[PDB]
């Protein structure tokens, strides 16, 4: 879980300040469409010399074995990044890329920055990829990790991550025709099929205010409009 | 009384049908397909997913050869490179400049996230189809009854004895080979288990991928170590699963050709929505009064009080009539582009019943039948 | 005049998980095509306890008009930055790109630093917008703002920013016909109309040696080469 004590690892690019540094990433795991990254550092977070804590870390510096509170030692990808949970050799944090993770002290010895290029995994959901959770409505499948403080790695777990939306589709039901006035701010996959007594296998990519007319039998249609899961009507308005 | 009606494969709109036999007491009949699940047997062929390359540390023999052979565990490939590093040059300063040998090994595994962020290659064998057919008989509006569509057994449920003559997805919109990504489902055909593919789906294969016991093709191609450094270089063709993510159709769930909400993993087609569904409904004679009321409905007229252009249920119309005896009439539209909202009509001696209807026509024109008399309505709107 | 009091405000990223900063940027105006920035901070710059100064600012942090020197609280990109003018609640400064401004105290282990990613905005001022200042060309009118205060917000103004220039439309005279061989080194908008009886209504974006031939009636034509307002030639062999 948080067994044994931290160690150093070779930083691929560091200053002349250090190189044999702490906080030198081994792996990062993604597939998140949230802004979180699961990080495996040489240094152990969630463990100080006192054993298990929730907001303290420990590190072998290659010069000293010491622990601190997370403050002076900040993770960044340009700007600071705030961790969420610690599981020993693994960190789970909010810090969106994870592709490169740069951990540096701008308080602790010299001006240290280690930047690490290391393993990542990321995947489309099957509509559009995103890594921003706003507060805009509907969510889509994503990956996240557990917040284990006890049983080393935080296991992968499915989760729901908010996706960017855009001005909602003006649906107009009409006679045998349902026109979908769409107004994306962001590329949306419009996948449709009619419902009721018809069904259309129709993918189209949309972006910018457009109209897309579809047949309907008087029995609606489903339209999935990217960054949303199915939005469907079965109206007799159709 | 058996009444066989044809319901649009539609969810949410109850489809009105008549148990009609005037001079008894016709029975209110509404059938709603709440859900249809085509559930086929899924035989998992293999997991395939985004690999993570694992490179073991290279076995270097200074002043001796290093031997390795190909191994079938994932797409493990090694290559023996001889005379790799001279003396006073190379990544190791080996005394022997020609007997220094590096074996460069690497292989692919599944990603840690593969378990939930992995795809599943499925063979599809014959299923069962359940259909949740809500058949109402008697002046209510709901019952909801499970019934086998596939040839198994007739629904001997008390809500009405249902035989569902083949649904408009009495088989799922599935091929024999289906990819489930566990997010979105695609009908996609791939090679049978035993051989992977590099730069297309099935880059890792294994009945269940564990990280080993896989048969893969990722086209791992060892390169000779660059001089002056210890390194284990390799090239590879595109990750074939990832290539498939970059070269797959529209999410079949969202474009299904039968209007089915195709759902993952145990593949099944939920809530199909194309065509119309034969429904055989046993509404017993017991749900009519046996010639003790006589619905003989005569002098019937339809006046539409209001109607709205092609609407959900914007139709308001009234049927004035004379009946010999009071009763209960199913007021229906045998269409699927029109249903009557009501499905009861209060027969009385000088009875008048205002019913709400739906049509999808420009001017809502629906045929209503009560017990004995039927009309088609047009009027004030 | 300025009189809108200093305040503290939450800034997304400071320290590690620190966010309880003063001096935090709320809004930015980047109307300039130069690398100067107009900043709206919670803290009031250009006012100490003595009132209006030119090299002091004030902030709260447990205070209400407490002041320090503009070098103690130092602006930075990833190197120091010196402000130029204070207009109370608004700062205006030179910070190398004017697209990243970080106002920070790098005093002690608690290191509050707010950063807002500032912007440079280019908008029509000729008949086209134009690029950031370079070695090439000469200054032209640009969108901007005042770079000294009134003794609270700085007001918009047209000032002068170096335009990227490259060879202007190299006119080649022919029998009452002008082919314009134009050789940008940068995205320039070529607008034309004839000033003869004819007209040449042509907007086109050009980059690099190209030709654009125009008709004339022997009575001139205009070519605007965006970043300038109309340039006109009249009945040469035009």
UniProtKB/Swiss-Prot annotation, chains A, C:
Residues 1-238 are extracellular. Palmitoylated via thioester bonds. These palmitoylations may induce disruption of the C-terminus transmembrane. This would result in the reorientation of E2 C-terminus from lumenal to cytoplasmic side. N-glycosylated. It comes from the Viruses. It is a single-pass type I membrane protein. It is found in: Virion membrane; Host cell membrane. Processing of the precursor of protein E3/E2 into E2 and E3 results in a heterodimer of the spike glycoproteins E2 and E1. Spike at virion surface are constituted of three E2-E1 heterodimers. Interacts with 6K protein. Plays a role in viral attachment to target host cell, by binding to the cell receptor. Synthesized as a p62 precursor which is processed by furin at the cell membrane just before virion budding, giving rise to E2-E1 heterodimer. The p62-E1 heterodimer is stable, whereas E2-E1 is unstable and dissociate at low pH. p62 is processed at the last step, presumably to avoid E1 fusion activation before its final export to cell surface. This is Spike glycoprotein E2. The chain holds residues 333 to 664 of 1242 of the full protein.
């Amino acid at each position: 879980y948080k067994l044994a004590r931290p160690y150093i690892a070779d930083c691929p690019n560091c200053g002349h300040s250090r190189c044999d540094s702490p906080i030198a990433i081994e792996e990062v795991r993604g597939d998140a469409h949230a802004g979180v990254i699961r990080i495996q550092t040489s240094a152990m977070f969630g463990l100080k010399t006192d054993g298990v804590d929730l907001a303290y870390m420990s590190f072998m510096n290659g010069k000293t074995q010491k622990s601190i509170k997370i403050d002076n030692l900040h993770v960044r990808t340009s700007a600071p990044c705030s961790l969420v949970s610690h599981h020993g050799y693994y960190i789970l944090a909010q810090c969106p890329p994870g592709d490169t993770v740069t951990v540096g002290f701008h308080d602790g010895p010299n001006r240290h920055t280690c930047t690490v290029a290391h393993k990542v995994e990321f995947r489309p959901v099957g509509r559009e990829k995103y890594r921003h959770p706003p507060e805009h409505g509907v969510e889509l499948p994503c990956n996240r990790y557990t917040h284990k403080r006890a049983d080393v790695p935080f296991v992968p777990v499915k989760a729901k991550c908010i996706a960017t939306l855009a001005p909602e589709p003006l649906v107009e039901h009409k006679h045998r025709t349902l026109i979908l006035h769409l107004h994306p701010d962001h590329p949306t996959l419009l996948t449709t099929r009619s419902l009721g007594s018809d069904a259309n296998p129709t993918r189209q990519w949309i972006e910018r205010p457009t109209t897309v007319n579809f047949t309907v039998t008087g029995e609606g249609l489903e339209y999935t409009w990217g960054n949303h899961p199915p939005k469907r009507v079965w109206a007799q308005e159709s | 009384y058996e009444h066989t009606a044809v319901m649009p494969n539609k969810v949410g709109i109850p489809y009105k049908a008549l148990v009609e036999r005037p001079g008894y007491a016709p029975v209110h009949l509404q059938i709603q397909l709440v859900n249809t699940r085509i559930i086929p047997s899924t035989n998992l062929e293999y997991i395939t997913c985004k690999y993570k390359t694992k490179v073991p540390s290279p076995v270097v023999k200074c002043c001796g050869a290093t031997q390795c052979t190909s191994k079938p565990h994932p797409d493990y490939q090694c290559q023996v490179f001889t005379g790799v590093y001279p003396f006073m040059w190379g990544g190791a300063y080996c005394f022997c400049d020609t007997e220094n040998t590096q074996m460069s090994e690497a292989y692919v595994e599944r990603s840690e996230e593969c378990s939930i962020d992995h795809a599943k290659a499925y063979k599809v064998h014959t299923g069962t189809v359940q259909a949740m057919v809500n058949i109402t008989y008697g002046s209510v509006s709901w019952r909801s009854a499970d019934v086998y569509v596939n040839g198994e057994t007739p629904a001997k449920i008390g809500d009405a004895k249902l035989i569902i003559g083949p649904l408009s997805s009495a088989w799922s919109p599935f091929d024999n080979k289906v990819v489930v990504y566990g997010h979105e489902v695609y009908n996609y055909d791939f090679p049978e288990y035993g051989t992977g593919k590099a730069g297309s789906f099935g880059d890792l294969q294994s009945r269940t991928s564990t990280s080993n016991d896989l048969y893969a093709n990722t086209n791992l191609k060892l390169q000779r170590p660059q001089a002056g450094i210890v390194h284990t270089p390799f090239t590879q063709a595109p990750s074939g699963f990832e290539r498939w993510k970059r070269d797959k159709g529209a999410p079949l769930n969202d474009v299904a050709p039968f209007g089915c909400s195709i759902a993952l993993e145990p593949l099944r087609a939920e809530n199909c929505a194309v065509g119309s569904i034969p429904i055989s409904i046993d509404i017993p004679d017991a749900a009519f009064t046996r010639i003790s009321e006589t619905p003989t409905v005569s002098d019937l007229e339809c006046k539409i009080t209001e109607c709205t252009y092609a609407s959900d249920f914007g139709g308001i119309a009234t049927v004035a009539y004379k009946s010999s005896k009071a009763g209960n009439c199913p007021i229906h539209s045998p269409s699927g582009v029109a249903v009557i909202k009501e499905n009861d009509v209060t027969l009385a001696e000088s009875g008048s019943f205002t019913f709400h209807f739906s049509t999808a026509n420009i001017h809502p024109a629906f045929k209503l039948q009560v017990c004995t008399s039927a009309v088609t309505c047009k009027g004030d709107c």
